[PDB]
Symmetry: D2
Subunit: 144 residues, 4 copies
């Protein structure tokens, strides 16, 4: 349900994850620096606090408050309560993060004030909301 | 919008397709014998004849009539009018075909009476129903 | 040891193979048009009629003689009589083929005059020469 | 040419690497615990001090060295993409390359999982084509 890989400080390249989606709950991906600031959360809400199939991007300092949510369209939430295998990729660009899902680009996310790279940790968190089918993590990768 | 591969008669291995889903229309995959009978259609209805996110599998002889529809759950249609990359595979087993999408097994389908392998041809067909994102075929594969 | 796909007339995309290499003998990939001209042969000689670890490309008319033979470097022939899986890809570009193996571009190859695409058939052929490990075909693909 | 991923300690699953090979030098893959013990190194010697195209496995805190056949060192001057996978099984590591099993390596006393670190290290020895790391993976 929770796994991380820590990388040698990363200012370019990509982080990827493959997982089987849950019918309920949320899958969260956290990109941290050593300060443990959240440079980016990619928070895919399957069914979460009354929201269905909602993707949320945000950042924040370690003991800190969420910035504004961004909510892109195009994340491959399966219909009808189904589940599937999802591959997600975060490019660490000069500009900001680039998020792709199944090789399709979802959103460009410019780096937030005082939170640019290097990334040093990439974390998967599945949180349940009484799902019939819970998320299964298959892999975590760093792309150089 | 229509593309096929022709193979030496296959009685095992697999046929795969990758494509970018459409927001409307249907993507059907046809597996034929040398007689041009349809041993199997894998009919992914994204938005077709007032149906939405429906998978239909059936068989019929060349000029004949469709037999009994099977409508399995789990095919990973995207929510919300979104598109994604879908990988589908059909194994040709001893007793039936095994259909999988994104590496997850969808259903097993016993060969219909007098419609057994060998498969000799595997064809992708997308038919529009005024989609704003039309299907894009990426590849067709034969597995030994 | 011989397998082929016939595709619809292809002026675009690519064609792929995946196989487990032989410790001797040759593996040839032929690209035909409808007339059965050889628009390209990618002939990988592991141990063949005097030669070891040599790559040969040519084209010929169905009738006629060969052309000037090109022998690129870079083809991943394994050392020491080992075998491995080889992935090979032939892009059908505007001006010639591009050959790659395991994702590394091996050579570009301008179309011989009188022998441009459409390509209508991609064929794999293994010919033994007393291998302790013969080749095994894993897949053939058309990319659009 | 040195990279690592540190993972929450793993007693099952797998570690993968993809890189483009060098024509000289060695690329070495290390599996470490918390104390930097070498639970296993997979040392692909393309051209390394007299040895050519040799695979070497071992562990340390040296000890007996295994030398499996079948690792896909390319012939001639050549380089390619290589995909190596190491499974953390119950009996030991299982190592494969380009989808093919190369050998099984029982854990050695004092050196069991969990694995906390997987590290790639290319050391050059005059290569005209240097190694290029492409990705490092953990499988769960
Ligand atoms: Cl119909």
């Amino acid at each position: 349900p929770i796994q991380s890989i820590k990388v040698d400080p990363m200012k370019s390249g990509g982080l990827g994850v493959v997982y089987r989606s849950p019918d309920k709950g949320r899958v969260s991906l956290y990109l941290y620096n050593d300060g443990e600031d959240i440079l980016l959360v990619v928070d895919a809400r399957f069914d979460w606090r009354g929201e269905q199939n909602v993707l949320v991007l945000n950042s924040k300092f370690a003991g800190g408050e969420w910035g504004p949510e961004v909510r892109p369209e195009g994340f491959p939430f399966p219909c009808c309560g189904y589940v599937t295998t999802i591959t997600v990729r975060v490019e660490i660009g000069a500009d900001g993060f680039t998020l792709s899902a199944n090789g399709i680009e979802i959103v460009k996310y410019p780096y937030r004030d005082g939170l640019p790279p290097p990334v040093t940790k990439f974390q998967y968190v599945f949180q349940d909301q009484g799902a019939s089918e819970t998320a299964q993590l298959e892999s975590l990768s760093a792309y150089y």
